Structure 1
Amino acid sequence: SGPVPSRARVYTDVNTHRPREYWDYESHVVEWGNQDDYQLVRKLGRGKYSEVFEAINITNNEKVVVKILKPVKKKKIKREIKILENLRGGPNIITLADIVKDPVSRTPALVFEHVNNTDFKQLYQTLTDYDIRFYMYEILKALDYCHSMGIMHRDVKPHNVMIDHEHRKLRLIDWGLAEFYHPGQEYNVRVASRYFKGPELLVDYQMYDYSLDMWSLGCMLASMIFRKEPFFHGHDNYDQLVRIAKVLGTEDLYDYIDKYNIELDPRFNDILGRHSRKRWERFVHSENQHLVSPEALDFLDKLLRYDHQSRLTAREAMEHPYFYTVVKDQAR
């Protein structure tokens, strides 16, 4: 008797009901454009797997953004392209415009529609209480959408959110780690950045689902309302789970482990030890007092749960009272 199986609470079969070509990205044949249509203007930034440029389409003189992919497995390029194509046109999802390949070096590059925005990590430590709620809600729109389309983002973090703060616009970017959810499928746990990895990743439970993204969202919320960047500041992968356990307590962690019959590393179990749960108000200070409300703490508590199946879905989050006034002014 190994680990207990798990299934997503919502959107479980959305890919099952789709035609195979929707999610079988390996069979998909990529129709590449002409790189000559694009000339690079200047550098915008650089990820771990890409270099990002401002560019111009010399066929309609439109501004675009080009993301030149650093060499990874060809299977990962088709997955990212297929996911971006499936999500194209969704609320707050970056819009893929074209796919091009270098004539000589054969390096693939993604072409996106240009939006004069800035990175969320440069803003999210200075927002008003209402602005935290507002942009959290826009992030949730993107996550509920992509989850409803059968896709887990798996790398939700401040650096992967873009803000056009003058137009109050938001985009969820970097779909290079995203995957299609299929019930019963076992997934790789080497996803997400350390500070935003869910406990299922840290204990090597492979049958996870969309709820992984909700843990990452909870880490972002905690960082914003408490002004602690990151909130769980683990120094290696084991220490990341220790930091979590020093907050949520070890009791609910071991219940989670036992619930899914997860075999933990012998020395790891002794590493975790015993820690009581800390009240969320223990992290409130005089300088983040204006950002912390009872509804904020109740919402955060309902995202940061060890048991991935107990976390709020994206739609349940959007109906949490924490967004009540945000939702009311969404009608103007």
Structure 2
Amino acid sequence: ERPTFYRQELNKTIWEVPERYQNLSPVGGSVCAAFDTKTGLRVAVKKLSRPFQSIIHAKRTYRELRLLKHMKHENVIGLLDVFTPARSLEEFNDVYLVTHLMGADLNNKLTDDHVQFLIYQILRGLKYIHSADIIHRDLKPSNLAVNEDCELKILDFATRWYRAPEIMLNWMHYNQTVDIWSVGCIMAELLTGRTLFPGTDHIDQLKLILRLVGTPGAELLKKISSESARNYIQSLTQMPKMNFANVFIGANPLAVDLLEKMLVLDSDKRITAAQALAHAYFAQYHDPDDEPVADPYDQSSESRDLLIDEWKSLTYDEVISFVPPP
């Protein structure tokens, strides 16, 4: 056991990886494309930079590695391998992560069947992520990778065009439907070929949002504990909710309807990922017996305040116990 490792120097640093990984080419922690000779796959190898430099780096390293090991779903980035050239904990300084080399992202105008398929897969991945009690919080085209056949994976990996309004108001307390807002913005752009809310700053962005969805109703105003937020919102010229048919001219009426259900100011009234999958817009793709869920991901490992060496040992344990996908 223990692969044989070989050394080389790429993009201003050294890389010790198993022989199975060949033809490393920087596309960049730093990243190289590689060919995995065992599986016949092209892969992304990430060498973490400075993984244990401080308590906070070490804790982040542990958290990222645990999260990637927990994610086991077709529409979510997964961990193909993790390794270290270290033979023991005492030698343990470097961590390398291996994932599917994804060809493109959604930043790289579509037919309706195609828009349907991409948003379907986003929602299928998001159902899974949300079922693990994880909120992504930064869904945007650059965090959505696609291959040849339009098969999509949500990436972990700034523009604020996809951000839910509550995040820009620094609400804290976020519901998982922050991500549904993002999906609505992404879907809108796939339909029209333009950014739905291209604000030049946070305030401009919120003016664009209000113009579409209209100013908060009394029902939402009842849920705002911030006195100054309330005072400001009341001072606004009441604007009505635009009719979405007139913004998304010619779009599939079912798409427009789903957009109306995602792009709601009140996060409590947004459709969930699981609900959205059953929307008639996705009739050709939806299968309730093939939209799997995750076990709850334990994030407590995260309110803890430990020593560097403790985070490092906990990370080492996670490297050693890794089992590659069968």
Tell me the TM-score normalised to structure 2 length: 0.70
Q: Say if 1:234 and 1:108 are closer, same or farther in 2 by CA, change over 3 A.
A: farther
Q: Does 1:77 align with 2:41?
A: no
Residue matched to 2:136: 153
Q: Say if 1:36 and 1:59 are closer, same or farther in 2 by CA, change over 3 A.
A: farther
- After superposition, where does 1:1-332 map in structure 2 within 5 Å? 35-37=16-18, 38=21, 41-44=24-27, 50-57=29-36, 63-69=42-48, 73-87=57-71, 89-100=72-83, 106=93, 108-114=95-101, 117-122=103-108, 126-166=109-149, 168-173=150-155, 175-176=156-157, 193-228=159-194, 230-252=195-217, 255-264=219-228, 269=233, 273-285=237-249, 289=250, 292-327=251-286
* In structure 1, distance between residues paired with 2:235 and 2:198: 17
1:198 CA drift (Å): 0.6
> 8 Å contact 1:146–1:152 — kept in the other structure?
yes
* In structure 2, distance between residues paired with 1:172 and 1:40: 26
> 8 Å contact 1:203–1:264 — kept in the other structure?
no
> 8 Å contact 1:154–1:212 — kept in the other structure?
yes
Deviations 1:16-48 (A, max 9, x none): xxxxxxxxxxxxxxxxx974325662234x5xx
> 8 Å contact 1:56–1:62 — kept in the other structure?
yes
SS class of match (2:43): strand
1:219 CA drift (Å): 0.6
Q: Say if 1:303 and 1:69 are closer, same or farther in 2 by CA, change over 3 A.
A: farther
> 8 Å contact 2:211–2:241 — kept in the other structure?
yes
- Structure 1 range deviating more: 136-145 or 230-239: 230-239
1:136 CA drift (Å): 0.6
Amino acid at match of 1:120: L
> 8 Å contact 1:39–1:58 — kept in the other structure?
yes
SS class of match (2:283): helix
> 8 Å contact 2:26–2:33 — kept in the other structure?
yes
Flag structure 2 segments of 5+ consecutive residues without an equivalent: 6-15, 51-55, 291-326
Greater Rg by CA: 2
Q: Say if 1:155 and 1:251 are closer, same or farther in 2 by CA, change over 3 A.
A: closer
SS class of match (1:67): strand
1:134 CA drift (Å): 0.8
* In structure 2, distance between residues paired with 1:65 and 1:273: 51
Tell me the TM-score normalised to structure 1 length: 0.69
1:106 CA drift (Å): 5.0
SS class of match (1:195): coil
Flag structure 1 segments of 5+ consecutive residues without an equivalent: 1-32, 177-191
Deviations 1:300-330 (A, max 9, x none): 01001111111111110000011113337x9
Q: Say if 1:214 and 1:236 are closer, same or farther in 2 by CA, change over 3 A.
A: same
* In structure 2, distance between residues paired with 1:146 and 1:39: 32
Q: Say if 1:39 and 1:213 are closer, same or farther in 2 by CA, change over 3 A.
A: same
* In structure 1, distance between residues paired with 2:188 and 2:177: 17
Compute the RMSD of aligned alpha carbons: 3.3
* In structure 1, distance between residues paired with 2:59 and 2:130: 21
Corresponding residue pairs, total = 265
Residue matched to 1:18: none
Bigger proportion of residues as helix: 1
Amino acid at match of 2:134: I
1:102 CA drift (Å): 8.5
* In structure 2, distance between residues paired with 1:148 and 1:307: 21
1:153 CA drift (Å): 1.4
Q: Say if 1:266 and 1:212 are closer, same or farther in 2 by CA, change over 3 A.
A: closer
Q: Say if 1:164 and 1:266 are closer, same or farther in 2 by CA, change over 3 A.
A: same
1:162 CA drift (Å): 1.2
> 8 Å contact 2:141–2:186 — kept in the other structure?
yes
